[PDB]
Paper text:
Asc1/CD98hc belongs to the family of Heteromeric Amino acid Transporters (HATs), which are composed of a transporter (SLC7; L-amino acid transporter; LAT) and an ancillary (SLC3) subunit linked by a disulfide bridge.
We further classified the dataset by using iterative 3D reconstructions and classifications to yield a subset of particles that were refined to high resolution by removing the contribution of noise from the micelle using non-uniform refinement. The estimated average resolution for the cryoEM map of Asc1/CD98hc was ~ 4 Å, with local resolutions as good as 3.4–3.8 Å for most of the map, except for some flexible cytoplasmic regions, thereby allowing the modeling of the Asc1/CD98hc heterodimer structure. The structure of the heterodimer was confidently modeled for residues 41–489 for Asc1 and 61–529 for CD98hc, thus excluding the flexible N-terminal ends of both proteins. The four N-glycosylation sites of CD98hc (residues 264, 280, 323, and 405) were also modeled. The substrate binding site of the human Asc1 transporter is in an inward-facing partially occluded conformation, with TM1a tilted to limit the access of substrates to the binding site from the cytosolic side of the membrane. The semi-occlusion of Asc1 is the result of a partial tilting of TM1a to an intermediate position between the fully open cytosolic gate of human LAT221 and the fully occluded cytosolic gate of human LAT125.
Residue numbers in the entry:
A (entry chain A): 41 to 489
B (entry chain B): 61 to 529
The structure:
Amino acid sequence: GLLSACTIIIGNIIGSGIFISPKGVLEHSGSVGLALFVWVLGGGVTALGSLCYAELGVAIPKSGGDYAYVTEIFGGLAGFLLLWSAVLIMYPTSLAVISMTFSNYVLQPVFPNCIPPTTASRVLSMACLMLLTWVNSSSVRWATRIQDMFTGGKLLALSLIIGVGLLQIFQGHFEELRPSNAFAFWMTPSVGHLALAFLQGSFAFSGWNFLNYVTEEMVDARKNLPRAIFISIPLVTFVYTFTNIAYFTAMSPQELLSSNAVAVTFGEKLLGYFSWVMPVSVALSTFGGINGYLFTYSRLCFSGAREGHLPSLLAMIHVRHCTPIPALLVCCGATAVIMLVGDTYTLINYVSFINYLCYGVTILGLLLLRWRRPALHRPIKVNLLIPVAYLVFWAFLLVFSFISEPMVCGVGVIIILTGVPIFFLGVFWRSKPKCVHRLTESMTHWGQE
Amino acid sequence: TGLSKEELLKVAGSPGWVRTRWALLLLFWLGWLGMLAGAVVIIVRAPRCRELPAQKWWHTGALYRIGDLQAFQGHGAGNLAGLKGRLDYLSSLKVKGLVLGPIHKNQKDDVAQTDLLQIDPNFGSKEDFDSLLQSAKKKSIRVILDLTPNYRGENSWFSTQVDTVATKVKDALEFWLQAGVDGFQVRDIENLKDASSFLAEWQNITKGFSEDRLLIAGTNSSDLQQILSLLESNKDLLLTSSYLSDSGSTGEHTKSLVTQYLNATGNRWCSWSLSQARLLTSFLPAQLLRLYQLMLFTLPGTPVFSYGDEIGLDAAALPGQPMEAPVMLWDESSFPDIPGAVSANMTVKGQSEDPGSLLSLFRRLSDQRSKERSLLHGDFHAFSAGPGLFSYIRHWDQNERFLVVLNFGDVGLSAGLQASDLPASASLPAKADLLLSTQPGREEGSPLELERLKLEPHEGLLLRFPYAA
Ligand SMILES: C[C@@H]1CC[C@@]2(OC1)O[C@H]1[C@@H](O)[C@H]3[C@@H]4CC[C@H]5C[C@@H](O[C@@H]6O[C@H](CO)[C@H](O[C@@H]7O[C@H](CO)[C@@H](O)[C@H](O[C@@H]8OC[C@@H](O)[C@H](O)[C@H]8O)[C@H]7O[C@@H]7O[C@H](CO)[C@H](O)[C@H](O[C@@H]8O[C@H](CO)[C@@H](O)[C@H](O)[C@H]8O)[C@H]7O)[C@H](O)[C@H]6O)[C@H](O)C[C@]5(C)[C@H]4CC[C@]3(C)[C@H]1[C@@H]2C
Ligand SMILES: *[C@@H]1O[C@H](CO)[C@@H](O[C@@H]2O[C@H](CO)[C@@H](O[C@@H]3O[C@H](CO)[C@@H](O)[C@H](O)[C@@H]3O)[C@H](O)[C@H]2NC(C)=O)[C@H](O)[C@H]1NC(C)=O
Ligand SMILES: *[C@@H]1O[C@H](CO)[C@@H](O[C@@H]2O[C@H](CO)[C@@H](O)[C@H](O)[C@H]2NC(C)=O)[C@H](O)[C@H]1NC(C)=O
Ligand SMILES: *[C@@H]1O[C@H](CO)[C@@H](O[C@@H]2O[C@H](CO)[C@@H](O)[C@H](O)[C@H]2NC(C)=O)[C@H](O)[C@H]1NC(C)=O
Ligand SMILES: *[C@@H]1O[C@H](CO)[C@@H](O)[C@H](O)[C@H]1NC(C)=O
């Protein structure tokens, strides 16, 4: 039973974050050193979080996705806030990043050492996102195997990278590896920039918030504590740091951050026609990534539509294919705004800060529950040290990393707090049978067929 | 609770509304098609940038010239085998070349005694040489060896009959190519007969062997016509001459000389060195090197520097110092004959710590020469300024661009603005952040108006600005 479970979690973990993140983590890491350390450390903290989340999953079984636990524990206020922050600034902006890096990697073939126009990249990203929205809609019967073919292209590309790198190291390729050639500091080693670099690896390790669905909604975990974490974490961090090693062995340090693309230049610097087979495979992988994110966030929309909040006129059945038509328009609008205005790596830092704040809130709530709960049944073995280690680590991260730039963090916490007035104005004052509230049902046909 | 009845929705669904749904779908797909068509148009009408010129190894990075290894190291440690210990320092200078001294056997103007196939035991041996190239290619420092019939006598190139002095060096070329060294330095060109054809034959042999090799030719002539006559056929040959060794000392004259040489050559590659093999210090006033380093380190070509130049070492200042072979100094113990004469403001360790030193400036512009493209293989156009001021802009077709200004007079200088002499692509802005200066008085990274340049005498500014489309 561990085979299919492992298949789905590693399908959810690996995305397109192994492409944009390396040159950012090197630009903010100071030098070639400590980059592998960051990529390993991220896997470690993600392992600790996955263990805590698995404990909560094998605990009391309330369904409803991810926001259900934080609605039931620590009040529904934190649950509504986390759901709002999700549907605003963790799914749509990540979808925007995925589509925009698809466009960036597609456009780089024609301009090898040249900056493409921004309008072409934005238009291509918009076209890709509309195509994937239509693909997720309508024909659901074959969309699953379409996404499976995309992930197969992903595995093919990554395996080819593994192959070329592994065969390459044997040809005495200790260049840009050993400390004699791995400790050149073009930029002074700073620890705030080290945290900013760690944010990119954090974005690369996204998807571990998604394992909570099917681990419980499957064959029952009869005290199956270790498998769900120790079949995922060490393999993926090893393959990630070895992919970074493979990237480093075929390139001088400067060429990796002296471009807007990490791959493609890899194909161009050696081989010659795998340089043409590779970017299309990377396009397939990011296609699968946006498709999977769309599927998961549609599941979010259904789960939130059950609870009644996040206004209930959303994600119904239309006629026959039972496809969430009203969900995908609300999806595409919040990413069309980003296609209108946005950049790449500031948004990467935004997403990293927001989702780590989300898991920190969830972990703190779980710890307060454990403090406040002497009852019910926990099938898992008690840990009592790794959660508090994660808690102090994450507190150190947020407190130390607030120095970076107030422009992103301030607006993020401002729209975090903006959920409060609508929350209380709705809970306390939706009982009034206003003309708008009475006639809200009338646009179920005026909005869709 | 706005859950509508399924039967109510089905009975509300009309064929007319189905037609409007089909119309909405068709216009949605038409909008997607229009986005694709706009992307195709804007990607097929885009300005196609040019390609990299695939320059060789010597086109990037400066060059280092070493006259005598005994003078470079010192008494007792002057053997050739000790060269490998200084490669860590030499790689810290970001210099991607090195020139050996004459290490063959030649006592004094003796054709029969001298023989170019053997290395004298005074310096080292073949095994030490092989270890030297092994350590050099372990690093990223190429090695260039020179040949000269006389490095002792004042008859430098064997004034006897010519074929016997030609065949030995002729076989020595392929002997040293099969040894492993790349490139050669040839000095005292003016002491030769049929030198143009001889240099053409040598360049032809080297190019027939390989393409990464080169051939450095040195002459003390300072005439444009003589230089053009020497380069009448060997256009690819790299030559260092005494062209810039004129007194000059004014920006208008320097503009005239540099522009005349560049226009006479065309736009081909050249070498920018002030002297044949001497230092910049002994042929120039001591208050000008802080700007001459930036001038030599930015002009299009390969700047060639003598050894002991990154600190401005002087031979005339120290008494009892032969001007041909000055002694390199590393600490206060490098000159045991006259203790106390040396100090900490010219030694290597002393200048390395100070950011306002010559060594710091050399490291700063050497870190910029290797890693940046625009001043590597960009263009070069100047502004028709007024008084003796130096002004030019270095740019590539798309990458970020550089501007350098210099002052040669003894009085303050104005902005000296001039424009409209460049294409629209090579348009300069009014805002540019300072990157470096000879004397630290300005804050780096601070943009300034380009019409308020209050330039101090004996000063030069390195300006920088992102590319503007
Ligand atoms: C569902 C909805 C969708 C919409 C929304 O909610 C969810 O999505 C949210 C999320 O997506 C948000 C974005 C997240 C990412 C954010 C990134 C942030 O960047 C920061 O911007 C600072 C502005 O000063 C600093 O950036 C540099 O700071 C230096 C020092 O002051 C300047 O020196 C330099 O300017 C330079 O001047 C000289 C020129 O030659 C250079 O070319 C130029 O770079 C600045 O760099 C940039 O300078 C530009 C011109 O001055 C802009 O200021 C730009 O930021 C702009 O900020 C606007 C503010 O909203 C934004 O609209 C716009 O698009 C951005 O280009 C800024 O970077 C800082 O180091 C940088 O980190 C930006 O400032 C706002 C930002 C984009 C946010 C805007 C608001 C959002 C969209 C939110 C919005 C509610
Ligand atoms: C370059 O270096 C030389 C040598 O130090 C400088 O002096 C010049 O040396 C040459 C040697 O050939 C002189 O040529 C002479 O020609 C007469 C013609 O009859 C001949 O009889 C001599 O035996 C000698 O060969 C030359 O006159 C002399 N001076 C000049 C001005 O060239 C030379 O000045 C340096 N600079 C240049 C630009 O050559
Ligand atoms: C550069 O050298 C060339 C050849 O000596 C000259 O350039 C030409 O000069 C004639 C006048 O004699 C002009 O009509 C041409 O337009 C010039 N062509 C170019 C490409 O410059 C001249 O001596 C030098 N050029 C300049 C501009 O001084
Ligand atoms: C480099 O350091 C030496 C150290 O001796 C400086 O020499 C000084 O020269 C002045 C000139 O009269 C003397 O009065 C001082 O006594 C000398 N020593 C010191 C310590 O100042 C030399 O001037 C320095 N170089 C420069 C350019 O300042
Ligand atoms: C060298 O000279 C020979 C003369 O036969 C010629 O064939 C060859 O092309 C020359 N080499 C180069 C690089 O032009």
